[PDB]
């Protein structure tokens, strides 16, 4: 009939809108993990004090 | 496919990302992008997945596979995305929005809330990573630069001049200087933080280098640290040296015809592993290989139908 | 910068000569109870702000507060940010900002 | 500034009808005057001539002819006032419904 | 001839009208400002209710948008191109960020030159003299509005 | 196709004869003007010239069109002479009003010597006591490319047509988007 | 500036210039002026008593009514500042007897120009100030009732 057209027809945009991955933003965070905010998101990973010379090698392949 | 040592990616006002090759001018795939424009595109430090980010959603896309959908979208926030950014081990993803915030994206499906938000009084244009990733920067359009610290929840404000708006902001690996440009073309330099141990996170002013009469849109150093592009509106691009900031090679597209009138801006540039061959996108419609010393083009790329403001180049870390 | 700049000069000096007759009218129009709803989107404190922003903008301490600027330099700044691209681009279409 | 606005065409009038609405002004302002009044008897020959010309075209010159032609045969005295009638017997067979 | 408005609040129009007699009246009694014969034209506002009124009509006006329109459908121009260039070089306008649409928005006003206003107010001049008088007042009409606009706070001038 | 004859006499030396030679033109264009309407008013020209002058723009311009490029060509030469030959305001005048009646119209200004002769009467209407028109005319070749000369010609107009804000915006405009230490002291 | 002790200062000299050249517009203005400028700044002073604006706001209601009087023509100014005092400060008794005496003195043809500023506060919850409006404007009807 009508109606079971178009139950069908939105059937079919179903299985391709099932194909993609939404986070949405929550207003939620370690507000009261103040003493933890050290380490989760403050690792301060200094290091890489010694430099590496290069020999062009990147683009010797590439030309 | 991005399973080669070098990729290339180009985005515009065409609603299509084309990916290219530094090897050949033939165009590997096309993927699609409606409704939206692309701001600025970069790639995960893995390699394997690229994130696309314009007008209240971050659109991504694979590499190693062929679908031309954004299998992983986020939403929430209500103006466009500035610019994306992440972590070198891939953990958390920073990006700045237009509507005066700037927050940190998790990329673990699980609750570890590592997210943070930042508020800011005006829109801000550029957000910048420390090479220790234990710093940020944050510059808005009232010309004051937030230095963004992560172990603690204070950040110094420093504003070289009011009234004018920046545009882009970057800090070289090999950290040695700190560089910006704001709505005037002035590229102001700082000296980074010496401190490495606690992060006394100290700045002084440098140097300034007059040029780019009209705006500056990028300036970004190089993997060596020895070289300095700044974009600008004139449709040129100066190259900087390190060692007392003298004019290295100098980058023009202009025509030299009065008929032409400005036909198309210069927006971004990127550097290769070696620092010898640079890639230029501007805003007609095509994208250019460049050269530091020859000065004159390599390759040239041309199967966008309209401008394109955003590119993202990378290859191997040797080189 | 001819007929137009100079009679902008004109206006804005007879303007800041006569600040308190200026001003008295339109005090009896904002702390109307009955006619400030519209402007409402304390009580009356936003039409606090509204003077004092009037009262600004007839001193030449609209700009920067820290200092007084003179008729020719207030008019300049004005002229400035009326025909700036950049503040012209962000307007409504219907607006028509390129005729 | 009606008038003075024919001499230059401001309304970008095409030059098919432009040269009788020219015309006919000219001829007005040297009628308005007593002052030519020996030059009443052939200007009133000339007008009705441009009526017969143009045909259901001259509709629109009737508010400008008519009001000042009326006050003529008023003051006007002599035998200029018999030739003016039958001239007047002329416009009025041209425009038929119009002089109402 | 007046206007009857419905759905409007013109009690508000009614005190500015009086700030403008204000004006008029520094204006006149200022050597160096009554010698320039400068003055700002106002209309008759006569509220009824609350939400109606009755303004006058002032004739001999016709606003600025019908004005160019009808200079540009003459000339064959069409009424919206400096609109269709920025829409042919970015389809998504609306939401391009602040320097983006600088950049469109400059790429407009290069390529199309802005002269309609300038030569439709001389096509409508009988005479050269006529033409000067008219644009002498034209200018300094328009300088008047924008400096009391400006301390009035006045918006939506299209 | 006999206005040639009316144009080019060259025997014009008093100021009477060119006016003799402004009235004889006028009447010969009514004569003769493709146009019943036009033709009726010339037995009214010779009995009173007043009533002819007025309509001098209205012939000449339906006389103009119909002629070919080689006819209208000999009548452009003929305008320059007697442009450049005379001082009389009177005849200057009807000429003058000749030049913008053609630049109203929808069919263009009549061509002359460079871009519409704007330089040769912008310098005519100077002596004629007609300011109006000679400032309409020095914009539009500002329009083309500024110089220094009109510059300077632009304030003096301006100055004896008791627009001395106006003059001054002029020279504002030379001091920021001219050359530097280029502004003569006069 | 204005400061507790450069008030006094201004008004003994201003005093002195009212009396020295009386029917001047420039002198009695500047006097009535200053004080409704005195009493703003106490008004804001406190906010952050009844007789200590009392000296300041009886002096300035009469002083506008002497410069409206001798204006006649250009005294928008001085005759909405008036309003400005009797609809904030009409409530007490000390300052009805200062205003019922300038309306009378005053010619009625010059609150033509502030009707608008009458009629909305018509409705004034005070009877002491409310009723004082409405017998000027039935006088207003005496003599041009087409206008109000």
């Known amino acids: 009939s009508n109606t079971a057209q178009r139950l069908e027809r939105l059937r079919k945009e179903r299985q391709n809108q099932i194909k993609c991955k939404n986070i949405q933003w929550k207003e939620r965070n370690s507000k009261q993990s103040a003493q933890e905010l050290k380490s989760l998101f403050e690792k301060k990973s200094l290091k890489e004090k010694p430099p590496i010379s290069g020999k062009q090698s990147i683009l010797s392949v590439r030309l | 496919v991005g399973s080669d040592p070098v990729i290339l990616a180009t985005a515009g006002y065409d609603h299509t990302v084309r990916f290219w090759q530094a090897h050949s001018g033939i165009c590997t795939r096309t993927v699609q992008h409606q409704d939206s424009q692309v701001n600025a595109l970069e790639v995960t430090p893995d390699r394997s997945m690229i994130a696309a980010a314009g007008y209240q959603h971050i659109r991504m896309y694979d590499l190693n596979s062929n679908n031309p959908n954004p299998i992983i979208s986020y939403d929430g926030v209500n103006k466009n995305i500035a610019s994306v950014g992440f972590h070198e081990d891939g953990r958390w993803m920073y990006t700045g929005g237009e509507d005066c915030t700037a927050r940190i994206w998790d990329l673990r499906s699980r609750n570890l809330q590592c997210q943070r938000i930042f508020q800011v009084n005006a829109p801000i244009n550029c957000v910048c990573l420390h090479p220790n990733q234990a710093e940020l920067i944050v510059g808005d359009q009232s010309g004051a630069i937030h230095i963004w610290d992560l172990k603690t929840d204070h950040n110094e404000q420093l504003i070289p001049e009011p009234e004018v708006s920046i545009t882009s902001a970057h800090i070289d690996p090999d950290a040695s200087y700190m560089a910006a440009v704001n709505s005037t073309g002035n590229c102001y330099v700082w000296n980074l933080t010496g401190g490495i141990g606690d992060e006394v996170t100290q700045l002084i002013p440098k140097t300034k280098i007059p040029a780019h009469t009209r705006y500056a849109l990028q300036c970004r150093f190089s993997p060596d640290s020895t070289l300095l592009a700044t974009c600008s509106a004139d449709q040129t691009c100066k190259i900087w040296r390190t060692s007392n900031f003298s004019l290295m090679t100098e980058l023009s597209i202009k025509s030299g015809n009065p008929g032409e009138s400005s036909r198309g801006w210069m927006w971004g540039c990127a550097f290769s592993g070696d620092s010898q061959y640079i890639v230029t996108a501007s805003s007609d419609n095509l994208a250019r290989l460049w050269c530091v010393e020859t000065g004159e083009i390599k390759r040239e790329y041309g199967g966008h139908q309209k401008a394109v403001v955003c590119l993202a180049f990378n290859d191997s870390v040797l080189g | 910068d001819g007929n137009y700049r100079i009679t902008c000069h004109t206006v804005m000096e007879v303007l800041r000569e006569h600040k308190d007759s200026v001003m008295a009218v339109l005090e009896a129009f904002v702390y109307d109870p009955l006619l400030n709803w519209r402007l409402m989107d304390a009580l009356n404190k936003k039409a606090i702000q509204i003077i004092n922003r009037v009262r600004d903008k007839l001193t030449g301490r609209d700009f920067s507060h820290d200092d007084t600027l003179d008729v020719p330099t207030q008019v300049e700044l004005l002229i400035k940010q009326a025909t700036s691209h950049e503040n012209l681009c962000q307007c409504y279409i219907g607006w028509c900002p390129f005729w | 500034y009606s008038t003075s606005e024919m001499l230059v065409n401001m309304g970008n009038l095409p030059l098919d009808e432009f040269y009788p609405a020219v015309s006919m002004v000219a001829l007005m302002r040297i009628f308005r005057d007593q002052s030519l009044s020996h030059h009443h008897t052939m200007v009133v020959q000339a007008i009705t001539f441009i009526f017969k010309s143009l045909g259901l075209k001259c509709v629109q010159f009737l508010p400008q002819v008519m009001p000042t032609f009326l006050n003529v045969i008023r003051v006007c005295d002599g035998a200029i006032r018999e030739f003016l009638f039958q001239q007047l017997g002329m416009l009025v067979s041209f425009v038929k419904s119009h002089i109402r | 001839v007046f206007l009857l408005k419905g759905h409007e609040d013109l009690r508000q129009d009614e005190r500015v009208m009086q700030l403008f007699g204000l004006v008029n009246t520094l204006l006149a009694n200022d050597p160096t400002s009554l010698r320039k014969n400068l003055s700002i034209q106002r209309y008759a506002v006569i509220p009824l209710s609350t939400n109606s009124g009755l303004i006058g009509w002032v004739p001999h006006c016709d606003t600025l948008h019908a004005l160019i329109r009808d200079y540009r459908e003459k000339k064959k121009i069409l009424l919206n191109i400096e609109h269709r260039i920025m829409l042919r070089m970015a389809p998504d306008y609306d939401h391009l960020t602040l320097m983006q649409k600088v950049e469109v928005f400059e790429h407009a006003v290069n390529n199309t030159a802005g002269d309609d206003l300038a030569k439709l107010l001389w096509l409508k001049s009988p005479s050269s003299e006529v033409w000067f008088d008219r644009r002498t007042n034209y200018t300094r009409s328009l300088a008047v509005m924008s400096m009391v606009g400006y301390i009035l706070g006045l918006g939506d001038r299209h | 196709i006999n206005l040639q004859k009316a144009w080019g006499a060259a025997r014009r030396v008093s100021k009477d004869d060119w006016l003799e030679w402004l009235r004889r033109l006028s009447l010969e264009l009514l004569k003769d003007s493709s146009s019943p309407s036009l033709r009726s008013c010339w037995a009214l020209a010779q009995a009173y010239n007043p009533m002819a002058r007025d309509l001098f723009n209205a012939a000449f311009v339906s006389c103009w069109s119909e002629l070919n490029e080689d006819q209208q060509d000999e009548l452009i030469r003929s305008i320059e002479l007697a442009l450049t030959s005379q001082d009389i305001a009177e005849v200057t005048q009807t000429l003058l009003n000749l030049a913008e009646f053609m630049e109203h119209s929808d069919k263009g200004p009549l061509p002359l010597r460079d871009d519409n002769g704007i330089v040769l009467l912008g310098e005519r209407a100077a002596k004629c006591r007609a300011y109006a028109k000679a400032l309409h005319y020095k914009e539009l070749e500002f329009q083309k490319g500024p110089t220094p000369a009109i510059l300077e010609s632009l304030i003096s107009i301006n100055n004896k047509l008791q627009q001395p804000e106006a003059a001054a915006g002029v020279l504002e405009y030379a001091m920021k988007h001219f050359g530097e230490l280029e502004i003569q002291a006069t | ?148």
């Open chain 7, 1 to 148: 500036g204005i400061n507790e002790s450069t008030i006094p200062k201004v008004l003994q000299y201003y005093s002195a210039a009212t009396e020295h050249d009386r029917s001047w517009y420039k002198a009695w203005h500047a006097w009535a002026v200053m004080n409704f400028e005195a009493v703003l700044h106490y008004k804001h002073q406190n906010q952050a008593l009844s007789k200590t604006l009392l000296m300041y706001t009886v002096p300035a209601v009469q002083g506008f009514f002497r410069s409206i009087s001798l204006s006649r023509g250009n005294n928008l100014q001085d005759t909405l500042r008036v309003l400005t005092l009797w609809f904030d400060y009409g409530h007490w008794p000390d300052v009805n007897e200062a205003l019922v005496e300038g309306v009378k003195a005053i010619q009625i043809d010059t609150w033509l120009q502030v009707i608008p500023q009458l009629i909305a506060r018509i409705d004034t919850p005070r009877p002491l100030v409310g009723r004082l409006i409405h017998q000027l404007l039935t006088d207003i009807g005496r003599y041009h009732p087409q206008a109000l």
